[PDB]
Amino acid sequence: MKIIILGAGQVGGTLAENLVGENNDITIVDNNADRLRELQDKYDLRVVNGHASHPDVLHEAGAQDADMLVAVTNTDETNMAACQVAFTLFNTPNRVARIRSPEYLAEKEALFKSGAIPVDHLIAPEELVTSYIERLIQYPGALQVVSFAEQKVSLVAVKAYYGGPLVGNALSALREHMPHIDTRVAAIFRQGRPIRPQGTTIIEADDEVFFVAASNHIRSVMSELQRLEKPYRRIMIVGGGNIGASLAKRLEQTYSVKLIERDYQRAEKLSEQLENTIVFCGDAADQELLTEENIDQVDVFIALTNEDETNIMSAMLAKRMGAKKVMVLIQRGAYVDLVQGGVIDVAISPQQATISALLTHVRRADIVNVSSLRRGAAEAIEAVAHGDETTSKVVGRAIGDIKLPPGTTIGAVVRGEEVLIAHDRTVIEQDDHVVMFLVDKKYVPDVEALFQPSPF
Amino acid sequence: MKIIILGAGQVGGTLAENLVGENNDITIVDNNADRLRELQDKYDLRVVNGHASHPDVLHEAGAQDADMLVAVTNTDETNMAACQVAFTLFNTPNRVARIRSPEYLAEKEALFKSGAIPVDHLIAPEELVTSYIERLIQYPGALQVVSFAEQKVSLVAVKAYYGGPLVGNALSALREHMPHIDTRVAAIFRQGRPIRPQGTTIIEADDEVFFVAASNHIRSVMSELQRLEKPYRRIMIVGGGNIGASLAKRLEQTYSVKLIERDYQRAEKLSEQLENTIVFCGDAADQELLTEENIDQVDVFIALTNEDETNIMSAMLAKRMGAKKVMVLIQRGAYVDLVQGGVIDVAISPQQATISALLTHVRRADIVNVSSLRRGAAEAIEAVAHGDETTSKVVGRAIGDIKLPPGTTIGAVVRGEEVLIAHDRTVIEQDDHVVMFLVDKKYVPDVEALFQPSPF
Amino acid sequence: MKIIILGAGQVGGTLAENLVGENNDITIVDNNADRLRELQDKYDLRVVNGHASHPDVLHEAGAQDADMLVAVTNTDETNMAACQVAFTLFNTPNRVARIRSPEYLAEKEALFKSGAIPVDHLIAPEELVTSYIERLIQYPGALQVVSFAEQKVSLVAVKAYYGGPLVGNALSALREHMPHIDTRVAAIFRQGRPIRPQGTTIIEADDEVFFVAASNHIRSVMSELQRLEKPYRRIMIVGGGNIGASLAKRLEQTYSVKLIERDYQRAEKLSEQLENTIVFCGDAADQELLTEENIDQVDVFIALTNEDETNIMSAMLAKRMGAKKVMVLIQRGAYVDLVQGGVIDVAISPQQATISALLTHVRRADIVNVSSLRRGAAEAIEAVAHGDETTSKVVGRAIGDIKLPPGTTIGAVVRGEEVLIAHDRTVIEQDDHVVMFLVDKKYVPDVEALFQPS
Amino acid sequence: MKIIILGAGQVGGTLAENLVGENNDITIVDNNADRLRELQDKYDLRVVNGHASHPDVLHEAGAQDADMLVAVTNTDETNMAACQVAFTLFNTPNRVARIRSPEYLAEKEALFKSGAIPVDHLIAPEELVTSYIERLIQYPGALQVVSFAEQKVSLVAVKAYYGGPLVGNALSALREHMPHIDTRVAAIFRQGRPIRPQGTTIIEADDEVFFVAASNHIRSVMSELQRLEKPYRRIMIVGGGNIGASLAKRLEQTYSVKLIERDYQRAEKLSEQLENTIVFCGDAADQELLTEENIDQVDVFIALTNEDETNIMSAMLAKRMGAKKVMVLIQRGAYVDLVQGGVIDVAISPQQATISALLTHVRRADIVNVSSLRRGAAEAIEAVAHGDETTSKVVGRAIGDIKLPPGTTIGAVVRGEEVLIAHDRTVIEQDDHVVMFLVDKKYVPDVEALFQPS
Numbered sequence A, B: 001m002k003i004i005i006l007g008a009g010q011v012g013g014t015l016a017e018n019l020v021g022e023n024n025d026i027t028i029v030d031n032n033a034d035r036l037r038e039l040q041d042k043y044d045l046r047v048v049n050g051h052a053s054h055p056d057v058l059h060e061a062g063a064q065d066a067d068m069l070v071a072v073t074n075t076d077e078t079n080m081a082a083c084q085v086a087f088t089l090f091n092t093p094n095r096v097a098r099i100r101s102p103e104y105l106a107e108k109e110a111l112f113k114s115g116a117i118p119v120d121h122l123i124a125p126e127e128l129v130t131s132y133i134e135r136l137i138q139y140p141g142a143l144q145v146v147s148f149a150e151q152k153v154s155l156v157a158v159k160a161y162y163g164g165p166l167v168g169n170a171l172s173a174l175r176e177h178m179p180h181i182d183t184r185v186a187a188i189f190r191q192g193r194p195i196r197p198q199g200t201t202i203i204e205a206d207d208e209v210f211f212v213a214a215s216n217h218i219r220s221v222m223s224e225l226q227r228l229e230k231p232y233r234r235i236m237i238v239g240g241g242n243i244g245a246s247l248a249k250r251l252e253q254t255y256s257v258k259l260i261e262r263d264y265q266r267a268e269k270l271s272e273q274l275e276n277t278i279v280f281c282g283d284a285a286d287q288e289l290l291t292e293e294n295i296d297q298v299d300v301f302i303a304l305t306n307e308d309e310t311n312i313m314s315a316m317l318a319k320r321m322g323a324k325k326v327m328v329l330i331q332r333g334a335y336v337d338l339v340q341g342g343v344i345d346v347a348i349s350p351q352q353a354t355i356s357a358l359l360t361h362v363r364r365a366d367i368v369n370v371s372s373l374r375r376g377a378a379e380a381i382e383a384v385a386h387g388d389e390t391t392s393k394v395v396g397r398a399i400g401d402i403k404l405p406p407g408t409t410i411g412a413v414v415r416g417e418e419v420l421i422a423h424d425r426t427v428i429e430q431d432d433h434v435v436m437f438l439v440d441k442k443y444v445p446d447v448e449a450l451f452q453p454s455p456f
Numbered sequence C, D: 001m002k003i004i005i006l007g008a009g010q011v012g013g014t015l016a017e018n019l020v021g022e023n024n025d026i027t028i029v030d031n032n033a034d035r036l037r038e039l040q041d042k043y044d045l046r047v048v049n050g051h052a053s054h055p056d057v058l059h060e061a062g063a064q065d066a067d068m069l070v071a072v073t074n075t076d077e078t079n080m081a082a083c084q085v086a087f088t089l090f091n092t093p094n095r096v097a098r099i100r101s102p103e104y105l106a107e108k109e110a111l112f113k114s115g116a117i118p119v120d121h122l123i124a125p126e127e128l129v130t131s132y133i134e135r136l137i138q139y140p141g142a143l144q145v146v147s148f149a150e151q152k153v154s155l156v157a158v159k160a161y162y163g164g165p166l167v168g169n170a171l172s173a174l175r176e177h178m179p180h181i182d183t184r185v186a187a188i189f190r191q192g193r194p195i196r197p198q199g200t201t202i203i204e205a206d207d208e209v210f211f212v213a214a215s216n217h218i219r220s221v222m223s224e225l226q227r228l229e230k231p232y233r234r235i236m237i238v239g240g241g242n243i244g245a246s247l248a249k250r251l252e253q254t255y256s257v258k259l260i261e262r263d264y265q266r267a268e269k270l271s272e273q274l275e276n277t278i279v280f281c282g283d284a285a286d287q288e289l290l291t292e293e294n295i296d297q298v299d300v301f302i303a304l305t306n307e308d309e310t311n312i313m314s315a316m317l318a319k320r321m322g323a324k325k326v327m328v329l330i331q332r333g334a335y336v337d338l339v340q341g342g343v344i345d346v347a348i349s350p351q352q353a354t355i356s357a358l359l360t361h362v363r364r365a366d367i368v369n370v371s372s373l374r375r376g377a378a379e380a381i382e383a384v385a386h387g388d389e390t391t392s393k394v395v396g397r398a399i400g401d402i403k404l405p406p407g408t409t410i411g412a413v414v415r416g417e418e419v420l421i422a423h424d425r426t427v428i429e430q431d432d433h434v435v436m437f438l439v440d441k442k443y444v445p446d447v448e449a450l451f452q453p454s
């Protein structure tokens, strides 16, 4: 697998970090020499200093031979130009590009899906975020929904609280309750540190507990944990930009939505374009605006401006003034787990989201796929069981008898269209998709080795 | 009292906001028309659009007749030029100027105190902050030390916690304990909202409780509340700029200080200039640097970079990694109370500090002086009891019999050199300094009226 | 004619300014509200605020109906995306784009000429500039060569001097002293004011005289006016960049070229890429370097750095130190007419060159285009004679019987591939290309009326 | 001589460049590491990185021991603080400061001349520029007036023309045809190269000839060279700013002045402040406005906006439209020598003017200062003859017996308040001020050796 990453920013670099290994040859292009040196010190990859869409720069990165091209530069127009130039001159297969402009996506069918602009897969960070928040809204009480390249399976995170079904009970004590639907804990995060879920792991308060669920039965699982809270009525959105306006349009038909936008010329525009949203012109930190429009009633306050501090301060104010749940948009995913949990209920990063999507396309045709759950060294992953018992170290063997790396816990198996909750006696069959959670991502290539069969 | 404020930034504007009234005529100079319109809408003051140090602009603000000149522009050199031009051309008395440069203050004696540069009072925001943090370090457990223009009296804030002397006990129940030293609660802040301290006010957890103390006996009061924790051993400072390097120099002789500075060229300089400080070159968010230098041992982690988010994220990480107490430098005082309390122990603003100092010079020769305790509408103040019983509405009368405005509580009286803890039977004598806390600062001019005697 | 210009910078703005008029609907798209306003204040055109390559912005500027799209934004990648989006979504005809990157141009065949990236016409200023200089070197004595028609016609500017062939002679007296060559004076600039060339106009010293010539007979005209100087032998180029390195390749095999380049790692690279050029490592203003390499022998000194300040100081030093002629590259177009002529013989601007080229695409699409000449010597336009005698006020008539506005001079008529030097007896036939020069831009729209049929 | 220059911009940099040499220890302070490096790369001087007014930065540049402090930073308030801090902390002598604000200058008496703000010498470029133009208007025909000594000596530049008094005459032939007036040609610039003025130098057309004259007898010299033109009657100023409004006040009472100002609220203000000036509201490039107000009658058109582009286009239009002479204000100093002379008669730069003034303070402190003339016509310096015959190689000798370097011409000798036009028999006495002109800057340090005693 020969991979070229155009632009070594947060997204390109983090991607590069997640793809270094045996079966992957990573080359990164960037015109900033400082960024290249920094990345090369940490990881085994090749670097090209130049403009990502220049024919020679692209040639020097070996676009004729490469198997995938990922364009994550500063600009859509450079990403588009890179994919055009690469395709036209070198026939480079699998061209993925980040496109941040909703204007382009509005014509994505006519522009990209016709091969006019030769992009195979658009990664639209603004769209992904809007979809994620909306999906959280759909499951009141849900702290995080984890996705895999296998769309049939998901994880749902919830926060344990005093006098809740979860707090105090060990994991094995929950397994005594089998009514209607049964799930298994995939991961724990207390105090920002990952705990490997064992039978005798006592759930403490303020833990972030991730349960395994079929993607089409999340509501049903949360219900059966007495953790599905009543539907959100009142949503308040701060920041009427690309993301804010998008989310409001998606919600206004089913929810009661208020939006605050401090630019009057932009705000007036949003009032007509949003038929069922009440749009206010005002500042996010304005106590008297938040009070006048009853912030004490708001079920979820969502801060979606582009400045993290504005969002943070705003949401912290909303919580102080009685908003039930608050969500903030944090730019860099590193800060997400940090700022989350205490006072701020949920933090979402457009960079994380982009990276999550990008890992579902690259890890495709690989053994292991990384999930959208990545916190520090911790991360949930999916691996494929190729081969039969004769050639594989996992196929045929039972889950309780698999030589997993340290810190690694198998949470569920996806066989065809059925999602099986992991048990010790369960036998891994061929071409299964095994979902694991690792406390430390350094053992991924070990998981890779484990699931890699002998040469047929 | 005729006051000219040069520069209507955060400091100038906030000052202007605090000084509007009957006995004060406020004029603000600024070259940004937008900033002027905004301020005039809210407050009764005069605005001049021009350069603060131009002879005509200064003339147009009435510098010949004015009684005080406050220079808080963007630049020290403009502040200095304004004070020179005002003095030389109009003999304007009482010239206060903000000087941010330690280089100038290093020669403050030869430059200002000689009348070469005609500044009467330097307001040095970097120095004030360094002094404040240091003063907090001196009283382990102290959340905030409140100062007044009467240097003889102070307030000390502490946070109530479960199984602590404070939590659960009503205020009257504390008055049953009179050993050695006795104090009175001046203010309460729970959930960021001010509560007027009454006899039957039950102290809840995480409340910010302010006790009255003589400025020279703070340690003695905290001791007698079982709230003076053991001396801080290990201090870790992030950001080796003006403030960070300053604080380290002050502490290194009495504390074990580590400093982190990400710029290697600046960091190397600090290693030699700080004889007893260990200086590290590295990033604030670097988990492995913080761990290698045992952040789990750090008694107080102090984030003093100029970026609030950097400081916030950094300190939140330090707390997660086990640092006992964390303090952050937040630029705008509005965010200070917001970000404080939850996870971040203390937030300090250089703007607040400047404003605090500026209010001790202006309110001088006034009736009321505002303290360094200002949180939203809430603020602690000091008023002077001028006149005798014949002409005053407060002198002679007992504290329990004073027609105070709503939300107002007298906490202590400073008579000469003795600080008297307020009791209901205490009689106000002449020229006393009465310390009150108001839940809403809108009643200040009422306090002013109350302490204003009849025309002699 | 509905024309869309993307980006209202120097080039986009000047262009619109050159085409705003009667038969032209100019819409300018730009990301900057302020540049649009200035343009609307000055001219009656439509302005659209948005990103030049966004589908809605292109549609809102009416790309569906438009007849030409000109992309002159900040970056090639936006120009390309814009041409792409316009073609794919709206089938916008005649898509012209500025492409500054030699890297993209190196693959011009594979990228653009195949319709992968749908640019119909590339305007590459660096190349045009390089080409212009080379064209000047080819005609020693030429201060300026301007093109009209499809470049089929040219003007050759020369400066008249004391004890010279031009000075002293009336214009009609020159038509009688030229035996087998046909030319016409198109414009003159003496003192600080432009003069309309008449029969009784005596050429005074230091005048810049513009002659009309067929492009394939420029050398023959200059020769027989005793104004074609002997071939340049020694050329010195300062600055080995895109333009410098390029111009050197074009010259080194037929001329003796030395190049000065202060970037030492760059100088080494060029030393290899230039088979017949001597590359010196040094600063352009270094006298001890310039005197060492015989600047007094240098026929043409060419300063091609990106710094106008360097170019000017460099050339003036060279001129001071005895170089015969000096040519500079000027970025800021305002100064070009000034900088040329006195101490510095020739000044060349990449923005001007772009505007020229964009107007050669105007000249092929049969729109009349105004252009100002050097130092306001005259404003030049080329117009088409539409209609027959019945519907046109010009077709059929001889030049001597046409009521042209004051200050207006017809210089030549272009019939197909045939260039007729304008004479009083010359009859304009239908669809002819009449190239004229005006002393005043205030009479510009009047000429349009002549050539616009009923 | 230990000299500190605060701020290494155009002015600070040029200054250092003019004074770096043998007897001068130049230290430049600047906030920008890059500007310092370029300066150190080019010249051997000391560079200090810090804020020009910080006590340690001033001390580290050796303000205690320094002999002159020049403040040419970005803002007056920093220049002032620097002069303040230097005086208060280190007693730094001769503190020169650039002050651009007319507001500060309006209170020059009360603020600076009293030692409240310890600036010894104010350099106010806007005023100097205004003063220069006014001085040009006073001597019609003067293209340039440059000053030497304590302004006691001047050069008057004029352009020679066909059928003119200068052209055709050898220089020695002019000394014999001037009856009761004494002058000397100091420099000439013909073609693109400077010529050393000798007896047998015949003046050709379009040469710029510089004459030496006592400052109090400039008019008498120009008159008796048949080169003093008749007084200007009609003046037109574009741009009513600090310089424009100021120049108008100085001219309106003795000349007929019209002013064009596109800022309408500004035009109204000036209409009141200018008792004898007609203020028109309009753009400078508006032909219908320029033709309405008889631009063909205008003796001098002066474009004083902050936009070079406006000034150039404005003036060239005026020159095109028949105005006798046009003068412009040019911000970017690189273009000045070029822009002047051809279509635009006079170009004036505020940065150059500042450098001149800063060098008049150099001329009072008895340091020899180099300055380049217009278009490199010659480099001019004024030097002092220190010592007696025993210790000096120049004192006592007559000019005709002094071995000057090649290209070097002594133009005048200044003894006290007495200006002696240089002659071969003229003997240099002690502490004389000898003003010389060099064609080449490479012979500059050689001249110092002559005047430096043992």
Ligand SMILES: Nc1ncnc2c1ncn2[C@@H]1O[C@H](COP(=O)(O)OP(=O)(O)OP(O)(O)=S)[C@@H](O)[C@H]1O
Residues within 6 Å of the ligand: A006, A007, A008, A009, A010, A011, A012, A029, A030, A031, A032, A035, A050, A051, A052, A053, A072, A073, A074, A075, A078, A351
């Ligand atoms: N035209 C270009 N050619 C090559 N590399 C580029 C180009 N533009 C940007 N880059 C590099 O690509 C990386 C990403 O660019 P940024 O300016 O960080 O854009 P961004 O929108 O912040 O995206 P990220 O990845 O979330 S920081 C940067 O590190 C740049 O150095």
Ligand SMILES: Nc1ncnc2c1ncn2[C@@H]1O[C@H](COP(=O)(O)OP(=O)(O)OP(O)(O)=S)[C@@H](O)[C@H]1O
Residues within 6 Å of the ligand: A238, A239, A240, A241, A242, A243, A260, A261, A262, A263, A266, A282, A283, A284, A285, A304, A305, A306, A307, A310
């Ligand atoms: N304090 C505030 N209160 C209310 N609205 C705010 C506040 N701060 C920012 N906004 C709005 O929220 C968004 C923050 O984004 P900005 O960084 O200002 O712009 P931007 O995000 O670059 O533009 P977009 O939306 O991505 S096309 C803007 O639309 C602001 O109008």
Ligand SMILES: Nc1ncnc2c1ncn2[C@@H]1O[C@H](COP(=O)(O)OP(=O)(O)OP(O)(O)=S)[C@@H](O)[C@H]1O
Residues within 6 Å of the ligand: B006, B007, B008, B009, B010, B011, B012, B029, B030, B031, B032, B035, B050, B051, B052, B053, B072, B073, B074, B075, B078, B351
């Ligand atoms: N030279 C000047 N003359 C007059 N007013 C000025 C000048 N410079 C700045 N101001 C105004 O003074 C105010 C404070 O300036 P800022 O640029 O905000 O400086 P600051 O260091 O941020 O100080 P603050 O008050 O904490 S925001 C601004 O609102 C400016 O509009």
Ligand SMILES: Nc1ncnc2c1ncn2[C@@H]1O[C@H](COP(=O)(O)OP(=O)(O)OP(O)(O)=S)[C@@H](O)[C@H]1O
Residues within 6 Å of the ligand: B238, B239, B240, B241, B242, B243, B260, B261, B262, B263, B266, B282, B283, B284, B285, B304, B305, B306, B307, B310
């Ligand atoms: N992530 C980080 N880790 C460690 N040190 C940091 C980090 N970010 C900033 N710093 C340092 O902390 C300070 C932050 O201030 P900046 O805004 O970069 O500079 P500055 O404060 O304007 O300069 P000063 O100190 O006020 S003269 C700087 O000295 C940085 O070197």
Ligand SMILES: Nc1ncnc2c1ncn2[C@@H]1O[C@H](COP(=O)(O)OP(=O)(O)OP(O)(O)=S)[C@@H](O)[C@H]1O
Residues within 6 Å of the ligand: C126, C238, C239, C240, C241, C242, C243, C260, C261, C262, C263, C266, C282, C283, C284, C285, C304, C305, C306, C307, C310
């Ligand atoms: N004083 C000088 N003497 C000699 N060469 C110089 C001098 N100043 C600049 N140059 C050279 O002129 C060249 C012009 O290169 P640049 O214009 O900077 O880059 P480029 O590759 O030509 O791309 P463009 O077209 O300018 S965006 C540079 O390589 C410089 O080294």
Ligand SMILES: Nc1ncnc2c1ncn2[C@@H]1O[C@H](COP(=O)(O)OP(=O)(O)OP(O)(O)=S)[C@@H](O)[C@H]1O
Residues within 6 Å of the ligand: D006, D007, D008, D009, D010, D011, D012, D029, D030, D031, D032, D035, D050, D051, D052, D053, D072, D073, D074, D075, D078, D351
């Ligand atoms: N506060 C400062 N302290 C020290 N040096 C400074 C300061 N501000 C500017 N300088 C330097 O002073 C020089 C003058 O810079 P500018 O004032 O920006 O140029 P300018 O206003 O065009 O005036 P000049 O000198 O004609 S370029 C610059 O090179 C700066 O690097």
Ligand SMILES: Nc1ncnc2c1ncn2[C@@H]1O[C@H](COP(=O)(O)OP(=O)(O)OP(O)(O)=S)[C@@H](O)[C@H]1O
Residues within 6 Å of the ligand: D126, D238, D239, D240, D241, D242, D243, D260, D261, D262, D263, D266, D282, D283, D284, D285, D304, D305, D306, D307, D310
């Ligand atoms: N095309 C034009 N026609 C007439 N007047 C103009 C034109 N362009 C600019 N101006 C005027 O020229 C004047 C010059 O003013 P400015 O230079 O902008 O300000 P100023 O008060 O002179 O301060 P300085 O010295 O430039 S920092 C302006 O008031 C403009 O209105």
Ligand SMILES: [Mg+2]
Residues within 6 Å of the ligand: A084, A115, A116, A117, A118, C084, C115, C116, C117, C118
């Ligand atoms: Mg295509």
Ligand SMILES: [Mg+2]
Residues within 6 Å of the ligand: C422, C423, C424
């Ligand atoms: Mg004829």
Ligand SMILES: [Mg+2]
Residues within 6 Å of the ligand: B084, B115, B116, B117, B118, D084, D115, D116, D117, D118
């Ligand atoms: Mg003083």
Ligand SMILES: [Mg+2]
Residues within 6 Å of the ligand: D422, D423, D424
């Ligand atoms: Mg003689």
